[PDB]
Amino acid sequence: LSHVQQALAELAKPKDDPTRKHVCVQVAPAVRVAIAETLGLAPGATTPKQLAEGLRRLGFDEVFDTLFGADLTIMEEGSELLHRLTEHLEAEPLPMFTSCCPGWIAMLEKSYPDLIPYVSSCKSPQMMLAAMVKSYLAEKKGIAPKDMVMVSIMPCTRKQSEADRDWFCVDADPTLRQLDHVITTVELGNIFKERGINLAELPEGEWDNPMGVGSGAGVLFGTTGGVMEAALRTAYELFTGTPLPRLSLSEVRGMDGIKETNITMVPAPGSKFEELLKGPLAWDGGAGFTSEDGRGGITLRVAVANGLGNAKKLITKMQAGEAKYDFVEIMAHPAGCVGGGGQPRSTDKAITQKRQAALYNLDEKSTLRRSHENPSIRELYDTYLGEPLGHKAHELLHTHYVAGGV
Ligand code: SF4
Ligand SMILES: O=S([O-])[O-]
Ligand SMILES: [Cl-]
Ligand code: NA
Ligand code: NA
């Protein structure tokens, strides 16, 4: 009936029931930090592996970290960004908009269909992971996609509408969903409480690797700063041969909910990028500089807009040419996903700051991890997907947009 009820019905089946399916769950980071609040505790007061244990006790056959999907998104979108940059250094338009927030995608399609060509063709992390589970993992385990159920726990309900886009299906059969059911943080919390499960008192469980082999979640130790920042890093580090530090965006004067930064990029010596330098949105042709000796570069102008109302104001200035950016992330909630509409309600005005702070442990925050270094990701491309942006990657991990909405 409801997606929660459908999910629980599948989990209710005995595992030796002939009609039992292989029921998988994936979990967003914003969920892991906020779920403790459903018990009246502080953000982060329950550990990620306590949650994994709780989910396994509900009956899930696989418990995945959505960050695995996010590593795919970083690979694809980093490649996409670099490709667009390359094309515009040679004379797929710039600026490029990210695509992970379904609140943005809905407003894009309904109110800004002329901007569609500028948006990343990448699916979200949850949809990339889901597509891979019902293709690669299904084949590896010898399970018919028909007998796989994919559930995600998300900080917002509208990840369901993302999941429901018709062509997010297996082998062109729209009844065979890549991602079946989305459950929110609060909904999951209520499931635990109704069953007398206290997450804070559980032993640590374990994650499953979407590759179907190896221990753990298939995600390396450390943090990325998110999909937008890591897509940037991927492109930057290839272009320059130098590391991109963790970003610190600064607030824009006289524009609510907008943060920005400028990234100067000098092409790596002897690279093709060094040789290269040597529509509705008025793109100024990029911000370029050059030195006397011939060591010039380009400056990449980046923006993050949180809140759709705030995003509309940014778009107006961009259309007017009063604001120039090359890469832009639009998220529908003011604090981003930690502030999603499926999150617990608090009287604390600073709850989203507490959630953001508890999102990752300090040890992991001191380690920068990079998607292309993940052996599980490497394996998937080497043995199944081929190349980022290739045909197979396009089929499974990329999407399109529909003027007027779906
Ligand atoms: S910003 Fe809000 S609507 Fe968008 S993906 Fe995050 S929680 Fe969902
Ligand atoms: O989609 S809602 O939960 O913000
Ligand atoms: Cl996602
Ligand atoms: Na299992
Ligand atoms: Na495991």
Description:
Its EC number is 1.18.99.1. The modification Cysteine sulfinic acid (-SO2H) is found at residue 24. InterPro entries: Cytosolic_Fe-S_CAF, Fe_hydrogenase, Fe_hydrogenase_lsu_C, Fe_hydrogenase_ssu. GO terms for molecular function: 4 iron, 4 sulfur cluster binding; metal ion binding; oxidoreductase activity. This is Fe-hydrogenase. The chain has 406 residues and is α/β, with parallel strands linked by helices. The chain has 2 domains: 1-66 and 124-202 and 335-367, Rossmann fold; 67-123 and 222-334 and 368-399, Fe-only Hydrogenase (Larger Subunit), Chain L, domain 3 (3-Layer(aba) Sandwich). The chain has helices at 3-12, 29-34, 48-57, 66-90, 102-111, 125-141, 159-163, 185-194, 227-240, 272-277, 308-320, 351-358, 362-365, 375-385, 391-397, and strands at residues 22-27, 62-65, 96-97, 148-154, 169-170, 173-177, 181-184, 250-251, 258-265, 287-289, 297-306, 327-331. Helix 4 (66-90) crosses helix 6 (125-141) and helix 4 packs across helix 9. The radius of gyration is 21 Å and the shape is globular. It binds iron/sulfur cluster, sulfite ion, chloride ion and sodium ion (NA) (2 copies). Sulfite ion binds at residues 156-158, 340-342.
